[PDB]
Amino acid sequence: TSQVRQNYHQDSEAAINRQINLELYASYVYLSMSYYFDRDDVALKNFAKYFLHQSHEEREHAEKLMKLQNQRGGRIFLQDIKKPDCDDWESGLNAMECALHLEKNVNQSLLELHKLATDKNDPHLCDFIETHYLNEQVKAIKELGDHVTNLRKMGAPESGLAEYLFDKHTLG
Amino acid sequence: TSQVRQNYHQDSEAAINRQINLELYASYVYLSMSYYFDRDDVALKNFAKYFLHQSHEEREHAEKLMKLQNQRGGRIFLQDIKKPDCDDWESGLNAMECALHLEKNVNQSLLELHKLATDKNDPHLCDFIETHYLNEQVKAIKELGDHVTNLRKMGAPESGLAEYLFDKHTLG
Amino acid sequence: TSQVRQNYHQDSEAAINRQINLELYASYVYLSMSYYFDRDDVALKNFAKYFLHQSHEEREHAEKLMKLQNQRGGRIFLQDIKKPDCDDWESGLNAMECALHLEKNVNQSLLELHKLATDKNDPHLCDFIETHYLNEQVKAIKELGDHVTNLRKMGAPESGLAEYLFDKHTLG
Amino acid sequence: TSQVRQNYHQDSEAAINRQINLELYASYVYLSMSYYFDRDDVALKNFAKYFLHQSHEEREHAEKLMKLQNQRGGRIFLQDIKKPDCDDWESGLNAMECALHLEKNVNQSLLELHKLATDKNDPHLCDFIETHYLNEQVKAIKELGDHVTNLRKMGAPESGLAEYLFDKHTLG
Ligand SMILES: [Mg+2]
Ligand SMILES: [Mg+2]
Ligand SMILES: [Mg+2]
Ligand SMILES: [Mg+2]
Ligand SMILES: [Mg+2]
Ligand SMILES: [Mg+2]
Ligand SMILES: [Mg+2]
Ligand SMILES: [Mg+2]
Ligand SMILES: [Mg+2]
Ligand SMILES: [Mg+2]
Ligand SMILES: [Mg+2]
Ligand SMILES: [Mg+2]
Ligand SMILES: [Mg+2]
Ligand SMILES: [Mg+2]
Ligand SMILES: [Mg+2]
Ligand SMILES: [Mg+2]
Ligand SMILES: [Mg+2]
Ligand SMILES: [Mg+2]
Ligand SMILES: [Mg+2]
Ligand SMILES: [Mg+2]
Ligand SMILES: [Mg+2]
Ligand SMILES: [Mg+2]
Ligand SMILES: [Mg+2]
Ligand SMILES: [Mg+2]
Ligand SMILES: [Mg+2]
Ligand SMILES: [Mg+2]
Ligand SMILES: [Mg+2]
Ligand SMILES: [Mg+2]
Ligand SMILES: [Mg+2]
Ligand SMILES: [Mg+2]
Ligand SMILES: [Mg+2]
Ligand SMILES: [Mg+2]
Ligand SMILES: [Mg+2]
Ligand SMILES: [Mg+2]
Ligand SMILES: [Mg+2]
């Protein structure tokens, strides 16, 4: 057993490994979305920039969980990073909707993780999740909701003008 | 009687207390409007910022009247601040129209106050109202009129694109 | 249902609306206290400044809860802001004692809110309350306790000299 | 008749001359009060400084009225400046009370002047009085009221310690 390990349940260790994979998966989804908007037949550069930034943030989320695993004396176990569900994201609106769904899925996973940490009476892990993840998810979900709303109200996805102007004014 | 009181009619004192309540009410209306635009299903951040600023200005208006009451040796009497008439403000245009109506109501109250001050030959109070309130109301009403006009001309409330672009160009 | 809503119980939503009202009420109590000390027959300018600052802090507390409501996909429901229990706060000491009682009442409401959030397994809401409210209340209550103690030891409320000197040395 | 004179009643001209004398009288009262506190057997240097400043402000008030008289084409007529009612002002509290009475008398004179200007339909003169005099009087009266209140509450005039500490904390 690790010389540093204390009050860290094997179930929590495993759940942290699963969360690491999910964060890496989210990074990959956003990477794919970003370059879709870089296609010459899509060509929305600020959508591309926005999603690339989101991708990099998810890699940071994964790295912090890997750090946590080692801090607590658990052992990192990695698995394949699955390719994103879609190759062609259809429109700015559809990509935003997919991102919203993704962030809500990630949030649900984090809430399940917190429930486990609570069940195993691991207040350090609870605080870690609350501090570094839970409000970040709430903010991300709210932002994506706001974006989806604006795109719908502007007339997306049918209006190419709507996505163009949103790209300039909201994401620019 | 207050050692400072001079040429300050009891009716004027009471009218100032009523005006304090009205200013606080206006602050509350604008606070409510602001957060309506912060809803994920409305999501117009500059409408939200604009109305929050207006809310804070109304609190300043109330505070200055409370200061005046004490300056003249009257006694502040507070009453409940009524909740705003609406919970859901419907659209950017409708909120602007409500604000216009509010500011015109507040102006009418101030004009009645000035008429009272004039009837009681209180030139200090007349000057106070003129200096700090009457032109501020005229400017506010004109600005809201301008805003309503632009939103109508742009195609609001039906055009979600109109409110979106107004949010960026006029309120941004 | 709001597109952003996740793990947010209707009871929590309602409790947040009640807390918004309480924060606004506290803002109003402190506003009233502030201007009492601005009366020509009370004339303690640093008591007035101290309570006005406290009033503005409570408005910020209310605004943050309104932001939270929208972040989580709840809907803000406002109610009348009740006037403060008192018109004449009697003395610096009595005002401090009323503020202490107010902050303890607000704290109790926040603890009930946290208990609800805990019962509904809402760790995001728990963390929000802990981070932004619970220690602020503990600090406020401690400060007001300290103030009450000093005023009593100095000879307030009978000693007008005590309140005068406290105004200069502690609140100045 | 003066080439500049327009809408300026002879009664208003005379009333302005009377007001000039009153302002000069107030300057003299405050000068006397100031040096009372400079006596070796009184020795409150900040009371002395406060009243000397007030004296200089009254001279400025007189000068502005002399300027106004010429601006409107009236002719300045000066009269003796009467010595102050008292030689020995007794205490800091008593001097403050005398100043309060003085400023209220000056205010009454200004209100009578404004009533005359109103009766003669002289809006320029009304605005002059409102702008430069009426709120200055309200502020002065409020400040002196505040000072009297604090001195009374602290235990003046019996408490030499009260006047000493007020001299340091409020006037210092
Ligand atoms: Mg262990
Ligand atoms: Mg896995
Ligand atoms: Mg992100
Ligand atoms: Mg993440
Ligand atoms: Mg596969
Ligand atoms: Mg997908
Ligand atoms: Mg946090
Ligand atoms: Mg947010
Ligand atoms: Mg444009
Ligand atoms: Mg009166
Ligand atoms: Mg009322
Ligand atoms: Mg305004
Ligand atoms: Mg107002
Ligand atoms: Mg009602
Ligand atoms: Mg309305
Ligand atoms: Mg006038
Ligand atoms: Mg004027
Ligand atoms: Mg003006
Ligand atoms: Mg204008
Ligand atoms: Mg829910
Ligand atoms: Mg309520
Ligand atoms: Mg506070
Ligand atoms: Mg609070
Ligand atoms: Mg009631
Ligand atoms: Mg109370
Ligand atoms: Mg903390
Ligand atoms: Mg503390
Ligand atoms: Mg003439
Ligand atoms: Mg004369
Ligand atoms: Mg002066
Ligand atoms: Mg003068
Ligand atoms: Mg004589
Ligand atoms: Mg005298
Ligand atoms: Mg003025
Ligand atoms: Mg004042």
Curated annotation (Swiss-Prot), chains A, B, C, D:
Q: Which residues form the Ferritin-like diiron domain?
A: 6-155
Tissue expression, per UniProt? Answer: Expressed in the liver.
The molecular function GO annotations come to: ferric iron binding; ferrous iron binding; ferroxidase activity; identical protein binding; iron ion binding; iron ion sequestering activity
Q: Name one GO biological process term.
A: immune response
Binding site residues for Fe cation 2: 58, 103, 137
Q: Binding residues for Fe cation 1, per the UniProt record?
A: 23, 58, 61
Q: What are the site positions for Essential for association with cargo receptor NCOA4?
A: 18
Keyword annotations from UniProtKB, A to Z? Acetylation, Cytoplasm, Cytoplasmic vesicle, Iron, Iron storage, Lysosome, Metal-binding, Neurodegeneration, Oxidoreductase, Phosphoprotein
Gene Ontology annotations for the cellular component aspect, listed alphabetically: autolysosome; autophagosome; cytoplasm; cytosol; extracellular exosome; extracellular region; ferritin complex; ficolin-1-rich granule lumen
- Superkingdom per UniProt: Eukaryota
Q: Among its keywords, does the record have Hydrolase?
A: no
Protein's cellular compartments: Cytoplasm; Lysosome; Cytoplasmic vesicle, Autophagosome
**What is an example of a Pfam family matching this protein?**
Ferritin
EC assignment = 1.16.3.1
Assembly notes: Oligomer of 24 subunits. There are two types of subunits: L (light) chain and H (heavy) chain. The major chain can be light or heavy, depending on the species and tissue type. In the human liver, the heavy chain is predominant. The functional molecule forms a roughly spherical shell with a diameter of 12 nm and contains a central cavity into which the insoluble mineral iron core is deposited. Interacts with NCOA4; NCOA4 promotes targeting of the iron-binding ferritin complex to autolysosomes following starvation or iron depletion.
Q: Which disorder is it connected to?
A: Hemochromatosis 5: A disorder of iron metabolism characterized by iron overload. Excess iron is deposited in a variety of organs leading to their failure, and resulting in serious illnesses including cirrhosis, hepatomas, diabetes, cardiomyopathy, arthritis, and hypogonadotropic hypogonadism. Severe effects of the disease usually do not appear until after decades of progressive iron loading.
Mind telling me what this protein is named?
Ferritin heavy chain
Q: Which organism is it from?
A: Homo sapiens
Q: Which gene encodes it?
A: FTH1
